[PDB]
Amino acid sequence: QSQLDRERILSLEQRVVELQQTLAQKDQALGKLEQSLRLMEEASFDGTFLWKITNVTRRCHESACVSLFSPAFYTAKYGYKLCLRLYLNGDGTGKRTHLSLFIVIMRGEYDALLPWPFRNKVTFMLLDQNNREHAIDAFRPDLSSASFQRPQSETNVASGCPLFFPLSKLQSPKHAYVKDDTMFLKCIVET
Amino acid sequence: LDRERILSLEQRVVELQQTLAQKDQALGKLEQSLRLMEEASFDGTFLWKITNVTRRCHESACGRTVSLFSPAFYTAKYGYKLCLRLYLNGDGTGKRTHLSLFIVIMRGEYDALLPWPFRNKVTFMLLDQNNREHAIDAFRPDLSSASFQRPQSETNVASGCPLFFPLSKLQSPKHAYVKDDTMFLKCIVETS
Amino acid sequence: RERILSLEQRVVELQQTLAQKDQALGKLEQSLRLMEEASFDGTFLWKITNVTRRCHESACVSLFSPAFYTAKYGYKLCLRLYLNGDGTGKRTHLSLFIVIMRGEYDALLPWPFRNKVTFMLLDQNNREHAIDAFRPDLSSASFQRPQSETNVASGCPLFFPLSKLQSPKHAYVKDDTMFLKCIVET
């Protein structure tokens, strides 16, 4: 009677530990359901996307001493799926000069019905928040690069403007590219 | 020693029941959040379906659930964040005599890029469902008021129509403001 | 020992309530996906995957697409696909229909539903799509205000030949996946 009541208390201990672990993976299942919902909210479907970057100097320091991806957006509800990739202290020819800003073609659930290569011309803006003089760059994709044909990974490799904006000019009194430690980047894809 | 173990399980079972409680909470408001994503608008006009009108009217006729908040809606994807606040049994100068309907400027993720104060003209409609004049009011919000400065908390104080529509006519035979215990409120915020 | 058993009760209570929390997760997950799927300009695109599989189980039933809407506050609609076919078309044709659903705002909308409907089975290569269309008639039960969750479906039996579906000459099916587009006019 004694040792059997002991075995019962011990299987209760094991069933409590087990419930603790099942509870943990229902919580992160809940987590990325939450993120699924967030990317639904942040997403645009007209080919204009606006990227609010908070805590700006913190992540610039951390870039100095790595790369950020935007929430996904779309050229149309049934068009191309894109996101942005931002190097706060630069990449490529702008390894430490500039903000380096690229588009990433992602694989969309309808890629079978769209033209390949992605040819759409892309316009990037760093928004001046007090004046209206935004810093603007633009390009048409280098045709057929493995950045721009149809993805067989969930993202192609990024392509764009590695010298989109130099860090020196970033906090000049003449503009407000950063305000309250926040920067706004705007991307316009033509449809 | 079995005393320590039975008490160590008593503490762990109460522990797991509370964490299970907060995953149930969290899932329930994830659920609510998804619904508020469904009802969100991005054109500056919002349509508010309020069901169980007789219930919720004599609800607010107790000290109970006096005011309703609409899901948030927006002038544009990157524009002002708004919601509506409805007193089914009235507030202020229309307490117990009118539905009182207000707009709430909320703090949006892009407020940094928009003109302040918020100035768009605001239109409220109580919609008659059967082919008759809707009850309509509108206003241009006044600039000197803190309801329209740039939000410093999650919401400014509401502003609107405390005497928007009188309760006696709400379920009037001659109108269809309530039909099958349902009413529709429409807000059109004029976009520049 | 009685406290042992009361703890076993509370432990099993925790387990089953947990499983309930799983099925809640699943239903909310699907709600989210139905939201992603939805469109609001009266044009909807339905990607069906694993086509050969679901044909073999069609012959072994019908699919409903996610809901879409003519506008934010307009008609709620969906599509009904028999991959094995219905009526004139049963076992020979794709039978594709539109389904008027009870919309949150039906009391505010004109009835009967009057908008033209076009069905397209899309060839994933440059040109030819299988296009069919119709304008609803006043009097059919498919197009009046729903007084249940869905009206009786209306559309295109014989909308496309089961034979020609996987012909090597057109890409209506490719990577075991087909795309149907519905265009409701506004």
Residue numbers in the entry:
A (entry chain B): 221 to 285, 289 to 414
B (entry chain A): 224 to 415
C (entry chain C): 226 to 285, 289 to 414
Tell me, in the authors' exact words, what the paper reports:
TNF-receptor associated factor (TRAF) proteins are key intracellular signaling molecules in the tumor necrosis receptor (TNFR) and toll like receptor (TLR) family signaling pathways that play critical roles in the immune system. TRAF1 is a well-known adaptor molecule that regulates the activation of NF-kappaB and JNK1516. TRAF1 is considered a unique family among TRAFs in that it lacks the N-terminal RING finger domain that is critical for relaying the signal to downstream effectors. The TRAF domain, which is composed of 7–8 anti-parallel β-strand folds followed by a coiled-coil region that mediates protein interactions, usually forms mushroom-like trimeric structures in solution.
